Structure 1
Amino acid sequence: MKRQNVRTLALIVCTFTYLLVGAAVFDALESEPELIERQRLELRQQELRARYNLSQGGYEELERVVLRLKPHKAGVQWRFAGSFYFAITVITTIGYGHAAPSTDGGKVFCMFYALLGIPLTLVMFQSLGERINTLVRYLLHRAKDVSMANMVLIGFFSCISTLCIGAAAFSHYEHWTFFQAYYYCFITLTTIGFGDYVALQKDQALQTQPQYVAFSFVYILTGLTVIGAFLNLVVLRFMTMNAE
């Protein structure tokens, strides 16, 4: 049929238009502040290097050392709590990359672990999302017909709710501002996970605050379920339509 091919080319051309707009806007927003801050740091580098009479080779070596110690500033991060947090970020595909396997054996196992883990996790969050959509239909009917205008509204406000209570929690535990914590929540639950903000890294929380570690694992696995129950409603309505 022609319809599927027209829809495919409409989606490809739309996606490349969306990328060219995104690239233009991010460049217009960020490429000047980047140059300003780079000039400022290139100045402060020479200021401190002169202030401590540091040889260029010595600065190069100190840079290499600091850039290798950058992750170990988190304290120990490979331990059972932190290995569970890593496994979460692998199979959910968040992948912050603050912890990443250092040995070749850890890399090979990480590859097989993701290989079997990601399908299984997609099938879990699909099944559980469809269960909670059915529950929402049932309870909304008991409160009365039900229509997409109600289901999508309840899904949308359930997402906005889980973002707000995530930002409220993390801006209290991590002392980020509310906007920073809300950004971290959004970037985690879409599974983008840049890793510029990462929870559990301060104050040895991975071995010191089991209640907060538990909260963060439950929040990640719950918010991903609510987002999955929203994509299950709003996107799988359209994606499988080629099979029609």
Structure 2
Amino acid sequence: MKRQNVRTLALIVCTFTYLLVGAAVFDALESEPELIERQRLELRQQELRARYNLSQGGYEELERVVLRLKPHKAGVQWRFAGSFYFAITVITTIGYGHAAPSTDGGKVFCMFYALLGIPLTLVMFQSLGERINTLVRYLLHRAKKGLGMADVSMANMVLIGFFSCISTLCIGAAAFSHYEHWTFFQAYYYCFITLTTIGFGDYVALQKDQALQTQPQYVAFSFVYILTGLTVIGAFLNLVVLRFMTMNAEDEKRDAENL
């Protein structure tokens, strides 16, 4: 069997076993706490329904209002600042879902917006990421020549790259634990889930004390952090991961080259 076919089959077997191992661990960590929390909330729901004389239909009518008011609770999510924050989440594939298009026209424009946006943003981060690596490689070469030597190795680049990722999450967690009044660990977890473009939406910045409309300085920092932070991670994947994606094309070209 060809090297390309062995490599692809190995990756499929790897991903599926990684999913089974992952599902096994998340079950061990989250199954029991979820059952405990569900049982606990089922009691509070019955106690509050009894306290304020609420029927099955009465609670259900009140349930619809509370859920529909959730995106409005944070404040105005769709003026210029909120629409820009949303535009960021779309093209960067973060998609928190804290604010999603409620109109059919909004949903349609979002699809066309993402179709051209996501490739543009992806290419931009890989291009700027490469320029950052080229600058770091030049700075390190000049420093080595300065102290007394001079060639910049791949290992030196992986070290600077990995430290840049740690520092970015630490700087972010320092700021988001301050402004969003979270613990350093929570703010760090938010920064990790944001900059990996997972964006669960369990933690979202600019959703407290009408920040999008009343705190422009914090909003400016938040946009600059998300964009610069994604460039730092983007530069690191351009350095380590990207080379493995062109591997099948390199081996296929080599096959035609020999034959």
TM-score by length of 2: 0.92
Using the alignment, how far apart are the partners of 1:62 and 1:10 within structure 2? Answer: 52
How far is the alpha carbon of 1:32 from its aligned partner? 0.6
Instruction: Give the structure 2 partner of residue 74 of structure 1.
Output: 74
How far is the alpha carbon of 1:226 from its aligned partner? 0.4
How far is the alpha carbon of 1:71 from its aligned partner? 1.1
How far is the alpha carbon of 1:76 from its aligned partner? 1.0
Decide which structure has the larger Cα Rg and report it: 2
Using the alignment, how far apart are the partners of 1:67 and 1:219 within structure 2? Answer: 30
Instruction: Give the structure 2 partner of residue 83 of structure 1.
Output: 83
Aligned pairs, number: 241
Using the alignment, how far apart are the partners of 2:130 and 2:120 within structure 1? Answer: 15
Instruction: Give the structure 2 partner of residue 189 of structure 1.
Output: 195
1:204 is matched with which residue: 197, 200, 210?
210
1:142-167, Cα deviation, whole Å (9 max, x unpaired): 01x11111000000000000000000
2:184 is matched with which residue: 161, 178, 183?
178
How far is the alpha carbon of 1:5 from its aligned partner? 0.4
Using the alignment, how far apart are the partners of 2:79 and 2:14 within structure 1? Answer: 45
1:84-127, Cα deviation, whole Å (9 max, x unpaired): 00000000010000100000000000000000101101110010
Instruction: Give the structure 2 partner of residue 119 of structure 1.
Output: 119
Most deviating of 233-242 and 187-196: 233-242
How far is the alpha carbon of 1:11 from its aligned partner? 0.5
1:181-229, Cα deviation, whole Å (9 max, x unpaired): 0000000000000001000010100010100000000000000000000
How far is the alpha carbon of 1:54 from its aligned partner? 1.0
1:18-65, Cα deviation, whole Å (9 max, x unpaired): 000000000111011111000000000001111111122111100111
Instruction: Give the structure 1 partner of residue 136 of structure 2.
Output: 136
Q: Secondary structure at the residue paired with 1:68? A: helix
Instruction: Return 5+ residue gaps in structure 1 as ranges.
Output: none
Most deviating of 227-236 and 68-77: 68-77
Using the alignment, how far apart are the partners of 2:168 and 2:89 within structure 1? Answer: 19
How far is the alpha carbon of 1:74 from its aligned partner? 1.0
Using the alignment, how far apart are the partners of 1:115 and 1:210 within structure 2? Answer: 30
Using the alignment, how far apart are the partners of 2:121 and 2:90 within structure 1? Answer: 10
| 2:19 paired with 1:23 | no
Q: Secondary structure at the residue paired with 1:70? A: helix
Using the alignment, how far apart are the partners of 1:32 and 1:200 within structure 2? Answer: 33
TM-score by length of 1: 0.98
How far is the alpha carbon of 1:237 from its aligned partner? 2.1
How far is the alpha carbon of 1:236 from its aligned partner? 1.3
Instruction: Give the structure 1 partner of residue 40 of structure 2.
Output: 40
Q: Secondary structure at the residue paired with 1:20? A: helix
Q: Secondary structure at the residue paired with 1:99? A: coil
How far is the alpha carbon of 1:241 from its aligned partner? 1.4
How far is the alpha carbon of 1:178 from its aligned partner? 0.6
| 2:172 paired with 1:169 | no
Using the alignment, how far apart are the partners of 2:247 and 2:233 within structure 1? Answer: 21
